């Protein structure tokens, strides 16, 4: 397991729209090793999520791994995630970011999101996230779209 360097706020890599993962990357040692190194980076910093741009990889891969301080959730790796629907109900919750290590704040998020994504093997999954996990999905997708949580306060 490798801990990768993390991009900080002010770095341009964090403001791009990340490129989708191609079909021939699915089920590849390349994609497993990218996700493993992202997972290790997230755990090193006690994060609950991570997005490939934060480790200088402009690709649509995220990890969501909730814990209470809310489910205790083992990391789920999402390739090419797409939020199909944001709920009408909207709640404010505390967020931090590995790319903004000095600040936390309250961000308004959809209470639930319907998310479609590919596993590392390339299986299509659709799941509805609620609560803290929903906030983490919305945060990580914002990283893929060049958006930091401080821009949403």
Pick one of 10, 47, 57, 103: the residue that binds its own copies (CB under 8 A).
Answer: 57
Residues between 115 and 144 that touch ligand K1U (CB under 6 A):
135-136, 139-140
CB nearer ligand K1U, residue 51 or residue 113: 51
H or E element: which one contains 33?
Answer: helix 29-44
Q: How far apart are CA 131 and CA 124, in angstroms?
A: 23
Pick one of 59, 76, 95, 118: the residue that binds ligand K1U (CB under 6 A).
Answer: 95
- Closest C-alpha to 59, from 36, 31, 85: 31
Which one of its own copies, Zn ion, ligand K1U, none interacts with residue 3, CB within 5 to 8 A by kind? Answer: its own copies
Rama region for 112: left / alpha / beta (φ>0; ψ in -120 to 50; rest): beta
Q: 5 Cβ partners below 8 Å, 6+ apart?
A: 55, 56
- The residues of the shown chain that bind its own copies, judged by CB under 8 A, are 2-5, 7, 11-13, 15-16, 18-20, 22, 24-25, 28-31, 33-34, 36-37, 56-59
Binding residues, by number, are: 97, 139, 143
């Amino acid at each position: 397991s490798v801990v990768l360097p993390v991009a900080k706020r002010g770095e341009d890599i964090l403001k791009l729209i990340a490129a989708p993962v191609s079909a021939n990357e699915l089920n590849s040692n390349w994609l497993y090793q990218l996700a493993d190194a992202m997972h290790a980076t997230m755990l090193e910093r006690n994060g609950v999520g991570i997005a490939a741009p934060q480790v200088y990889i402009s690709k649509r891969v995220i990890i969501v791994a909730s814990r209470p301080n809310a489910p205790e959730m083992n990391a789920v790796v999402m390739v090419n995630p797409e939020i199909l629907e944001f709920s009408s109900e909207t709640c404010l919750g505390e967020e931090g970011c590995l790319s903004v290590p000095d600040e936390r704040g309250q961000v308004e998020r959809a209470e639930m999101v319907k998310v479609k994504y590919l596993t590392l093997q390339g299986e299509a999954v659709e799941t509805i996230f609620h609560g803290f996990p929903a906030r983490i999905v919305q945060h990580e997708v914002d990283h893929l779209n060049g958006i930091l949580f401080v821009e949403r306060i």
